[PDB]
Amino acid sequence: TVSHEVADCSHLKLTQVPDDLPTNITVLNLTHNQLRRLPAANFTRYSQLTSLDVGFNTISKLEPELCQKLPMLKVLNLQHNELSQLSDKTFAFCTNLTELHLMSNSIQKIKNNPFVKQKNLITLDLSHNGLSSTKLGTQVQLENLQELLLSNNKIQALKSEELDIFANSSLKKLELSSNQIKEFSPGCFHAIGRLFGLFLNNVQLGPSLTEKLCLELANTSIRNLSLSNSQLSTTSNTTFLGLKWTNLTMLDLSYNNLNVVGNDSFAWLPQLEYFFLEYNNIQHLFSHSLHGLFNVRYLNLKRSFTKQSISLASLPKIDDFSFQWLKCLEHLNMEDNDIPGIKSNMFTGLINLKYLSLSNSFTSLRTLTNETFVSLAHSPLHILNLTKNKISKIESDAFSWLGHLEVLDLGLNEIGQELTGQEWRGLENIFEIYLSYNKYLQLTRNSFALVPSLQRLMLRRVALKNVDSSPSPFQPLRNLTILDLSNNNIANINDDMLEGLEKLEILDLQHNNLARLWKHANPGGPIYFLKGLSHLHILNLESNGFDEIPVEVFKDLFELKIIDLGLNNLNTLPASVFNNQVSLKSLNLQKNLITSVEKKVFGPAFRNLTELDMRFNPFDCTCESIAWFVNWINETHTNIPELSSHYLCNTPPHYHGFPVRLFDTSSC
Amino acid sequence: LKGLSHLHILNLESNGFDEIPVEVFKDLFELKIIDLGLNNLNTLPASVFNNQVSLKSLNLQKNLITSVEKKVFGPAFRNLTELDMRFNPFDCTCESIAWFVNWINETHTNIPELSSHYLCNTPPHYHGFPVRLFDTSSC
Numbered sequence: 146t147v148s149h150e151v152a153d154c155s156h157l158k159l160t161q162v163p164d165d166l167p168t169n170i171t172v173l174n175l176t177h178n179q180l181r182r183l184p185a186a187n188f189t190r191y192s193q194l195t196s197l198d199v200g201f202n203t204i205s206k207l208e209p210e211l212c213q214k215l216p217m218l219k220v221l222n223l224q225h226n227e228l229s230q231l232s233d234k235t236f237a238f239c240t241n242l243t244e245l246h247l248m249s250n251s252i253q254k255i256k257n258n259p260f261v262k263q264k265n266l267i268t269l270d271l272s273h274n275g276l277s278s279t280k281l282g283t284q285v286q287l288e289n290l291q292e293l294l295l296s297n298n299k300i301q302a303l304k305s306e307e308l309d310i311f312a313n314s315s316l317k318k319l320e321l322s323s324n325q326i327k328e329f330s331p332g333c334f335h336a337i338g339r340l341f342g343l344f345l346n347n348v349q350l351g352p353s354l355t356e357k358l359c360l361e362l363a364n365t366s367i368r369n370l371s372l373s374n375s376q377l378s379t380t381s382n383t384t385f386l387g388l389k390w391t392n393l394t395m396l397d398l399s400y401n402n403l404n405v406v407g408n409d410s411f412a413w414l415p416q417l418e419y420f421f422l423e424y425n426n427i428q429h430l431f432s433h434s435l436h437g438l439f440n441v442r443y444l445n446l447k448r449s450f451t452k453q454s455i456s457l458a459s460l461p462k463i464d465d466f467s468f469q470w471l472k473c474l475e476h477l478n479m480e481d482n483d484i485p486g487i488k489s490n491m492f493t494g495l496i497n498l499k500y501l502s503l504s505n506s507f508t509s510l511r512t513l514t515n516e517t518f519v520s521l522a523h524s525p526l527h528i529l530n531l532t533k534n535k536i537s538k539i540e541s542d543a544f545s546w547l548g549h550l551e552v553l554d555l556g557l558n559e560i561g562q563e564l565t566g567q568e569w570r571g572l573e574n575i576f577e578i579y580l581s582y583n584k585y586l587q588l589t590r591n592s593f594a595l596v597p598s599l600q601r602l603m604l605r606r607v608a609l610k611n612v613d614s615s616p617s618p619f620q621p622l623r624n625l626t627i628l629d630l631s632n633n634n635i636a637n638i639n640d641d642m643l644e645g646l647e648k649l650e651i652l653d654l655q656h657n658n659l660a661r662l663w664k665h666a667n668p669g670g671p672i673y674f675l676k677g678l679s680h681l682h683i684l685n686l687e688s689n690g691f692d693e694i695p696v697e698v699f700k701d702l703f704e705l706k707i708i709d710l711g712l713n714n715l716n717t718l719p720a721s722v723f724n725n726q727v728s729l730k731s732l733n734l735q736k737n738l739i740t741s742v743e744k745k746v747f748g749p750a751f752r753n754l755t756e757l758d759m760r761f762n763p764f765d766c767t768c769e770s771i772a773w774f775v776n777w778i779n780e781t782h783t784n785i786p787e788l789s790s791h792y793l794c795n796t797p798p799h800y801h802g803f804p805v806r807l808f809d810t811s812s813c
Numbered sequence: 814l815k816g817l818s819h820l821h822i823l824n825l826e827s828n829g830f831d832e833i834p835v836e837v838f839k840d841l842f843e844l845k846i847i848d849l850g851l852n853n854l855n856t857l858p859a860s861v862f863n864n865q866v867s868l869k870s871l872n873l874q875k876n877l878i879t880s881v882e883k884k885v886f887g888p889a890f891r892n893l894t895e896l897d898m899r900f901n902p903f904d905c906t907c908e909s910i911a912w913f914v915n916w917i918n919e920t921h922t923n924i925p926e927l928s929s930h931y932l933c934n935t936p937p938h939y940h941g942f943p944v945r946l947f948d949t950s951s952c
């Protein structure tokens with residue numbers, strides 16, 4: 146039971162409260178134990194506890210005197226117990242409680258007044274009980290209560306009198322989810338002084354009972370309303386009529402299997418700002434279906450439409466100008482849908498749209514022509530996501546309508562083509578382009594000549610072709626900072642591929658075939674493609690088949706901090722190859738063929754490191770191979786994980802399998 | 814491989830083997846050709862080729878073998894015609910290849926590309942040097 150300021154006793158098999166703890170302990174966690182009871186005498190020593198989490202135990206009942214020994218108790222958690230009965234004296238002395246959690250206690254009913262005495266209580270949780278009513282008292286108490294959780298009970302109706310005890314309470318959260326409520330008596334929500342949030346998830350209401358509830362919620366202070374999985378199959382223009390008399394800001398209608406939304410179904414919500422409609426079954430979206438929602442800023446439509454059906458091929462249909470009402474919309478999410486395509490006025494009217502996600506939103510979007518995004522011309526779009534749409538071809542001026550765009554994600558598609566460079570015309574403010582995991586991309590001289598402001602370019606797993614053009618395709622990218630070219634099986638690179646890219650910081654080249662370029666027998670000499678990269682910080686050259694490293698390939702990389710060279714075939718390294726790496730913090734050389742670690746090579750590299758990774762190597766445990774290295778290991782602050790297990794000698798056979806760190810250098 | 818008394822040719826090349834159980838070849842008395850190249854073999858148990866009294870061709874190229882010792886290769890190297898252990902990281906030390914280099918010095922078995930592809934790997938003093946040029950006068 147480790148404890149310095151908070152005491153935790155989780156899964157300690159404790160049957161009684163330990164009596165050997167610091168006196169000044171304020172938090173005592175006793176969850177998942179076998180505490181049968183909580184006698185006050187065992188808590189006499191602890192007179193300064195603030196939070197006592199005793200849930201998930203076998204407490205059947207408590208005593209009022211327990212709160213006498215804890216005058217400063219604030220949070221009391223009795224989750225998952227069997228306190229089926231409560232008394233008016235049970236919580237009388239606990240006058241400073243803020244949170245009282247009584248979930249899953251098999252409480253059947255509340256008799257007279259178990260919560261009258263406490264006045265500073267903020268949240269009361271009574272979920273997963275057997276309660277059949279909201280009756281918690283007779284007089285008016287719980288003045289400062291803000292959250293009332295009553296989920297997963299047996300409550301079947303709401304009555305005004307049952308809630309009358311909350312006349313002076315401003316309920317910020319009223320959770321009634323998973324209770325089969327079938328009747329909302331008039332004035333039931335007007336009993337609460339101020340109700341700000343109501344949750345009715347997993348409560349089978351239906352359109353008619355929804356209309357009754359909305360009429361019952363009128364002229365209240367409600368701001369958040371959640372009706373997820375409420376069996377709301379259809380909506381009409383009279384469904385939320387009562388909500389005309391409130392200032393609702395958030396509405397949740399997800400998982401309702403909603404099929405048809407009538408025109409002006411939400412015209413009663415002029416102040417709505419957050420709308421959630423994910424995971425529904427909408428067949429057709431009409432022009433006036435979203436009419437009257439001009440204050441909405443966030444709309445979620447993920448998985449909101451009917452899926453592909455092989456019986457009738459009834460793809461969901463979105464009428465044109467169906468979003469023209471959303472003048473203040475800024476964030477639109479439409480992922481995981483089966484929309485056939487993008488029409489000429491799909492997004493017309495969205496004059497404040499800044500984020501649009503269309504990841505996996507379409508079934509047949511193969512070609513991105515110059516008319517695809519014309520409806521987004523007047524939107525100030527900054528981020529566009531188009532992943533997983535099986536896009537195959539991008540034509541010229543495809544994104545010419547997006548002049549303010551900064552992030553464009555086109556990965557996880559089937560784009561196989563040659564980048565002529567005309568696809569990026571009009572992208573005057575672009576910063577990031579993601580193209581990883583496509584069919585094949587072939588570069589040319591002017592592939593990126595039209596986007597000089599680019600800063601991040603990801604080209605992983607695209608089977609890059611012609612990256613070795615005599616004028617480098619990356620030459621115009623003077624502001625480029627992150628470049629990813631991994632897993633492309635690239636074999637040939639010219640020495641001026643990265644010339645002029647003084648701002649480059651991250652370069653990923655792992656899982657290519659660049660081994661031949663660094664061999665001294667390569668015709669014309671080794672290729673020095675890392676020159677001039679003064680600001681480079683992260684270099685990844687893992688799994689390229691390298692056998693040898695030219696001595697002067699890292700000479701210009703003064704600010705380099707992380708270099709990864711594992712999974713290569715490196716055995717012998719030239720001396721003074723890491724001389725200029727004066728700021729190196731992480732070196733990775735695992736799963737190579739390295740046998741000796743010597744000062745003339747690794748001296749400057751091992752100067753001030755944080756992490757070292759040279760695990761699966763055939764170390765030759767000899768006084769001229771690892772003596773300096775093992776002495777360095779003996780005294781060093783660099784973190785070397787799995788040092789005692791995966792750093793094993795290979796030769797001589799006397800040392801085969803022995804740990805490198807246990808090599809004895811006393812006779813060197 | 815048990816019970817195969819009349820087996821003559823065995824090919825186990827490129828199976829990813831790391832270790833060989835000591836008693837896998839015990840019943841193969843008439844075995845003449847065994848191919849174990851392109852595996853990941855480094856350490857072999859002693860007396861693993863004891864019963865191969867008629868072995869004529871042994872192939873162990875492109876493995877991870879570092880030491881060739883009498884307790885393993887003694888009976889195997891008795892009367893051979895061909896030996897193939899070319900691309901291996903030989904540890905040129907007096908306890909790793911001294912018996913092997915002495916055996917190479919006087920033997921009638923044909924060892925092609927002995928002077929070029931049998932190169933030391935460790936210690937770094939010997940890295941790249943031919944195995945056959947190892948000096949055992951100070952062993």
Ligand SMILES: *[C@@H]1O[C@H](CO)[C@@H](O[C@@H]2O[C@H](CO)[C@@H](O)[C@H](O)[C@H]2NC(C)=O)[C@H](O)[C@H]1NC(C)=O
Pocket residue numbers: 153155174175176196198
């Ligand atoms: C007391 O400790 C328990 C166990 O660590 C906390 O209960 C849950 O523990 C699981 C497993 O670590 C977490 O996944 C949950 O998130 C924890 N519950 C919550 C609500 O976060 C318990 O919360 C701790 N109690 C206090 C007062 O810190």
Ligand SMILES: *[C@@H]1O[C@H](CO)[C@@H](O[C@@H]2O[C@H](CO)[C@@H](O)[C@H](O)[C@H]2NC(C)=O)[C@H](O)[C@H]1NC(C)=O
Pocket residue numbers: 480502504530531532552553554579
């Ligand atoms: C575009 O949307 C996709 C899908 O929602 C995002 O992909 C997720 O990215 C996060 C963070 O990288 C990962 O943890 C998830 O696993 C990804 N999901 C899938 C299905 O791959 C992607 O990040 C978005 N792109 C941008 C630029 O926001």
Ligand SMILES: *[C@@H]1O[C@H](CO)[C@@H](O)[C@H](O)[C@H]1NC(C)=O
Pocket residue numbers: 285312313
């Ligand atoms: C608390 O409720 C009582 C009874 O309705 C009322 O008289 C009193 O003014 C309320 N307190 C406040 C601060 O409104």
Ligand SMILES: *[C@@H]1O[C@H](CO)[C@@H](O)[C@H](O)[C@H]1NC(C)=O
Pocket residue numbers: 360361363364387390
């Ligand atoms: C809300 O109050 C207004 C103004 O008093 C009233 O006209 C309307 O009928 C009320 N709504 C309901 C559902 O009673």
Ligand SMILES: *[C@@H]1O[C@H](CO)[C@@H](O)[C@H](O)[C@H]1NC(C)=O
Pocket residue numbers: 317341342368369395419
């Ligand atoms: C209302 O909903 C929004 C969005 O889900 C949330 O951020 C906010 O906290 C909610 N209001 C209250 C009072 O909890």
Ligand SMILES: *[C@@H]1O[C@H](CO)[C@@H](O)[C@H](O)[C@H]1NC(C)=O
Pocket residue numbers: 382383
């Ligand atoms: C709802 O729409 C119908 C169909 O046009 C219309 O007759 C009715 O008046 C509308 N309801 C309200 C409350 O306006």
Ligand SMILES: *[C@@H]1O[C@H](CO)[C@@H](O)[C@H](O)[C@H]1NC(C)=O
Pocket residue numbers: 407408431432433
């Ligand atoms: C109203 O809805 C019906 C069917 O839901 C649709 O045919 C009609 O066009 C809609 N009204 C307008 C003005 O679009």
Ligand SMILES: *[C@@H]1O[C@H](CO)[C@@H](O)[C@H](O)[C@H]1NC(C)=O
Pocket residue numbers: 515516
């Ligand atoms: C799109 O390209 C076609 C073919 O070049 C051209 O005829 C058409 O005018 C272009 N569209 C726009 C809006 O420029």
Ligand SMILES: *[C@@H]1O[C@H](CO)[C@@H](O)[C@H](O)[C@H]1NC(C)=O
Pocket residue numbers: 597598623624
């Ligand atoms: C590159 O960044 C610098 C500094 O922010 C800026 O002056 C320059 O305009 C940028 N280049 C382009 C083409 O946006």
